Subunit: 419 residues, 3 copies
């Protein structure tokens, strides 16, 4: 009837338009057609106000963990009056990430490249001649009766020497962290069928007229210094840096300029009465590739591409304050509806991959859930997503385990492990 006295519909439309325009003018990005976002988180709130002339301007302040997928609800209502609409504070993305650089490939030794010579008289040359990266071997006093090349009559004299380098079958690629790690956090104001989002970092709070948000955090040091990569999966553990040949994964290293390895060749020889000796070479470098096979896959790490991303729980706290005018505000939340539609587990006890479980999950909302098991877990919370159905986790189950149980939010499921 009148713009003086608006009905509830146009009053709410006006308020949401005002918020949207404020956020957009302060560089929040509008996102549309997002999946369902039904807030799980509610904590205490602080409510306050100031009056200008005779008009009360009230606010609500609260905070939410900087946890991927988590959101909190605020209901907006007329003073001592009816509910109008909801504002959701939604932590749309939390990940840690760092750059990595390629160091070398490794794998088992499958052959030896070798060179050798012998001399009838004189002592072994100093040094033993060799290519860079090749290790040497030699024996003095190699000329003797019954053990002569053709035409040599020297006794307890001469030399047999050479050099060698392993040949490997490449199986793992090894990378080193080549940046500081950093948090990547995006937070959204979610209103009915529209969201307004922005990355947030610790030096620059998000400021609009009605809504302010900031992250409080602490520098993290969560990501591994060296990793090994096989078949798109990230392994961590006892891994040599480039140039180190300690007896652990990656003691033989194939990279752009050649191969690196060390060790004392297993070198001997067999005699002939009037022919060159045969070199018996049973090992060149030491190679501890079997250590690579025992590296543990870290399911929290994924290759983004080099760039690695780590799934993490909380990276801090998002504070927020909402001041719309003369309103009442209250927090709300709802437990998510999650079902574990299926669960398959296979693996073993004390093993590198432990007990690997594939879950199919249904959820009515983007959110974050507690994950529990009768086994030990390698995450405490898992982000759930209507647009993703398949989730995988790694478990550490005792040898005395006949059923694996897993719960996500309030959902439970069990399976007998697939051996």
């Amino acid at each position: 009837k009148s713009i003086n006295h608006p009905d509830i519909e146009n009053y709410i439309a006006a308020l949401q338009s005002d918020i949207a325009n404020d956020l957009t003018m302060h560089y929040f990005k509008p996102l549309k057609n997002l999946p369902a976002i039904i807030p799980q988180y509610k904590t205490m709130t602080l409510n306050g106000d100031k009056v200008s002339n005779g008009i009360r301007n009230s606010y609500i302040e609260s905070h939410i963990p900087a946890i991927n997928g988590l959101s909190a609800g605020i209901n907006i209502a007329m003073p001592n009056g009816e509910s109008l609409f909801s504002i959701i504070i939604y932590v749309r993305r939390v990940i840690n990430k760092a750059s990595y650089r390629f160091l070398y490939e490794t794998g088992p030794t499958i052959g030896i490249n070798a060179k050798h010579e012998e001399v009838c008289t004189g002592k072994c040359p100093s040094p033993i001649p060799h290519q860079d990266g090749w290790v040497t071997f030699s024996k003095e006093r190699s000329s003797n009766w019954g053990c002569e090349e053709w035409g040599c009559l020297a006794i307890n004299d001469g030399c047999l020497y050479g050099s060698c380098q392993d040949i490997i079958r490449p199986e793992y690629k090894i990378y080193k962290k080549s940046s500081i790690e950093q948090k990547d956090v995006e937070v959204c104001i979610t209103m009915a069928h529209e969201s307004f989002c922005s990355t947030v970092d610790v030096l620059q709070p998000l400021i609009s007229d009605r809504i302010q948000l900031d992250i409080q955090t602490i520098q993290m040091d969560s990501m591994p210094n060296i990793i090994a990569v096989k078949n798109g999966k990230v392994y961590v553990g006892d891994i040599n840096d480039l140039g180190s040949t300690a007896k652990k994964c990656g003691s033989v290293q194939l990279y752009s300029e050649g191969i690196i390895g060390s060790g004392t060749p297993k070198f001997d020889y067999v005699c002939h009465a009037f022919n060159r000796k045969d070199v018996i070479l049973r090992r060149c470098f030491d190679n501890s590739y079997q250590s690579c096979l025992l590296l543990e896959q870290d399911n929290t790490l994924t290759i983004a591409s080099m760039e690695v991303h780590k799934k993490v729980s909380s990276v801090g706290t998002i504070n927020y304050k909402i001041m719309l005018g003369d309103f009442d505000y209250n927090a709300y939340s709802t437990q998510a509806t999650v079902t574990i539609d299926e669960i398959r587990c296979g693996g073993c006890y004390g093993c590198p991959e432990g007990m690997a479980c594939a879950l199919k999950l249904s959820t009515n909302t983007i959110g974050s859930c507690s994950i529990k098991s009768n086994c030990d877990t390698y995450i405490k919370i898992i982000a759930v997503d209507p647009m993703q159905s398949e989730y995988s986790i790694k478990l550490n189950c005792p040898l005395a385990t006949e059923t694996v149980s897993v719960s996500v939010c309030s959902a439970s499921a069990y399976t007998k492990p697939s051996i």
Copy 2:
């Protein structure tokens, strides 16, 4: 006289009963007969209210570090009126923990299991025969005049070969972390002779009608990946993972399926004119057990049982809000009364155990104290407990140290180190 006009006694009894019932109905656990809890912590508070009809409903909000043993006091008073009672927010437990799994035992080499054979003619067999886990050794051309088994006349021919594996005396057990680490935090509402407690984690704030609490935190990565255990004590440092034989602690590994070691045996032999050669074996594997002796004990780690617990300082912040009705609220605290009843220190400078001190402490309260020394310390704060009298700490004191001084809260003590 009247339930309309209650005296102070029954008014306070009613309010504390109302709180207790609220907390219990919202799944807080009632604890009784706890030791003295006299709060040490006070910071700024936020005070606020709303009136419904004509009744004011006021609150106080504040926060306290998630630190084991720490507590904060809130005094409840009539508006512009007398004090009624106190509510204490008490951080009853903070620890980090993770599961571990057994990898192997190690210790010094005390003998060699060995096998050997010789052949009169021919070259060394390929491969040298051996059991799994045994390393091999061989020498070609072992038959010669003056150096023959009975009936052999071969010259610069034949072979002497064998295999070996160390025997160790087990001294340390080595474990690997086999779960994510997690915080274990319990917080209590402490009123006169009754406490109401609950574990708290980051996804689920503690909600009752009158009192809300939450923890804000960040994922931690505080606990070691590999440890060595001797006599109930946890050591950390240069420790091989299972299957790695780098020259550091644990290069020889005794586990369920056998022993793991590597190296080039120190193998030679002595001749007889018409009898088998004697094998001289001065070393089989390399063994770097002396590195285990230099591992540092980490006094913050304890075996719970595998499960390890770590003592830590802050793991985050506990926020809390209290809204009882029409009251005034103010924070309070009191310095703890701590005495160092005795102190004994023994050790040395640059040593694995450093300077080890046993303290006997008295305290009038569960609490958390700053610990200081003229030496370097391995903790900055220590939890104090009326039910525990003995405390031990590790110090790093310079060679130029003749008296060790230590303070805990306001208490001081000194001793000459016991060498």
Copy 3:
């Protein structure tokens, strides 16, 4: 005219005097003649009050990251009235630090100290005689025709043995962490030409009548366990602990009591018909010093002196509350004016030092800036200081890089790398 009705000048002087006296009486330290401090940080604020009789006493509460150099502004104004003065909350210092202790020196092998003997008859002695820390070598059956010392006629008998220890040229000094690490945080109340400062730690908030501050934090584990030091610079990576001789940096260790190394000497000998054999010794220990050359310098670490300091981003949150009486309060900030006056970069891609850049920066304020680059960086924020003009950073630039770009706060600069 009257002390009843003060002008604005003496009213502001009175209020600032009252604050200064309060802070000083509560053990804040007065600092004078500090560089310009113009606050960059503003987030949401909470405003509140209580009236006593008829006098309103109002407050403002907010928080600021515990970040070195950062500050936040609060403007103090008459109620519905004019601005009076400003209070700045200034995080004057944030660093992490720990003590370290000297382990050993290492560098390349440049010679071998050796001893040897031979015997005409008998087998090699058990053990081979040697000094502590020397490795042994021996060969049985060393006496033969054509290969005898003067007067020996033994055949396939006798022994040649000895011991050896590397000589190195010292290049790096290796230290181990010998304390817990700790935060060192100082915060100031900054008013016109005077600041009031105090260290703050998590157990003890800073309390005065008008202003309270606290730090909320979490235990950090940011600093390396072992480091290598060369020319005042700190290197981190694959570094042996004292007594460990794995094939990585520091496998040969010179310390107070001697040298530590391990390995199988490359030992052989040459014959004479009637003179002692010549010992050919081509290597004693294994030495993996070339690994030290590939260690990465960590520019966030500096030697304070042993004591090491680490530059870090946020270590937590500083909360603060200001209550002066009947005032209005509002937050404010200003973007810093920073210029990159020059930038020089030199280095290479995949290299230990990466791409090293020296910057000359101008700034109108102590502050904290975001640092960005087209290359990868090893810090995300950098503290800027009017009293410091030279800043250096390390970059990880791809082989496909022809111009290095760097921004600090809003300033940008680029250079072609100096190769």
